[PDB]
Amino acid sequence: QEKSITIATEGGYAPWNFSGPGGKLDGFEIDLANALCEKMKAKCQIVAQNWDGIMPSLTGKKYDAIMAAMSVTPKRQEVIGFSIPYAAGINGFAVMGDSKLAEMPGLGETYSLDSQADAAKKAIADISSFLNGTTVGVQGSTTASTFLDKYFKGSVDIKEYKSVEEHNLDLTSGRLDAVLANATVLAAAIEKPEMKGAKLVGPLFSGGEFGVVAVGLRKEDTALKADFDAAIKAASEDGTIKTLSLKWFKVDVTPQHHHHH
Ligand SMILES: [Cl-]
Ligand SMILES: [Cl-]
Ligand SMILES: [Cl-]
């Protein structure tokens, strides 16, 4: 009876999905896939693969599902099917603890830009005047880069970087006073030893503009989408996602109801 589906991942984006000794895949998405497959009553094989042909391999029926921090976009929806989201994009600020900026009492608030925009707009105003005149770092060509441009332009000096590590290295130096980045990336980076003193400050921002992550499936595989959708829904309500999210990321990525069928 039981379905045997192959799940593809990148294997090079810790703590979401990362490589092992001979071939042991680990991370948030691996523990989540194992959990969803148990909810589905399916046998699953997780394979790591270069993103290049992940993709023609899925449309070619070599793979049946993709779990590689894959954002739902209008372009991807034209070519592939998507499950309901299993993670929502979250951005936050990090400063050095010994700095006067380390006390934005907006900790540890979490505001949706879609369902709590009122609380979000009031919070970004509190921040814009606290951060007034400061040099804020960000990785160029991201949702955090766009967010900082839309709401924090004029209030702060914005410096774009080509990696999170490069802006984090200039925060410890004093070159930058604050960084804004994906909260899963940020909490991981501040665990590095040359990153001691740095801490997550102010509120967490979630919303559709930060994107959402879901399972990539064949556009024709409507039954597999129905199976993933039921398991994702159950994993969201019983707190399986919150658990794994906090375990790997120290932040809760569980999405909201409005990102439904
Ligand atoms: Cl584990
Ligand atoms: Cl098959
Ligand atoms: Cl959901």
Author numbering: 21 to 281
Question: Can I see the authors' text?
Answer:
Two Agrobacterium ABC-transporters and their cognate periplasmic binding proteins (PBPs) OccJ and NocT import octopine and nopaline/octopine, respectively. Recognition and import of opines are conferred by periplasmic binding proteins (PBPs) and their associated ATP-binding cassette (ABC) transporters. The PBP OccJ is associated with the octopine transporter of octopine-type A. tumefaciens while NocT is associated with nopaline uptake in the nopaline-type A. tumefaciens. OccJ shares 47% sequence identity with NocT and belongs to cluster F within the PBP structural classification.
We report the X-ray structures of the unliganded PBP OccJ and its complex with octopine as well as a structural comparison with NocT and the related PBP LAO from Salmonella enterica, which binds amino acids (lysine, arginine and ornithine). The mature PBP OccJ (256 aa without the signal peptide) expression plasmid was obtained by cloning the occJ gene lacking the first twenty residues of the signal sequence that serves for localization to bacterial periplasm. The X-ray structures of the unliganded and liganded OccJ with octopine were solved at 2.35 and 2 Å resolution respectively. The liganded form adopts a closed conformation whereas the unliganded form adopts an open conformation. Indeed, superposition of the two structures results in an average RMSD of 4 Å for all Cα atoms and a structural comparison shows a 49° rotation around the hinge region of the C-terminal domain (residues 112–226) upon ligand binding once the N-terminal domains (residues 21–107 and 234–276) were superimposed leading to a movement of 10 Å for Thr163.
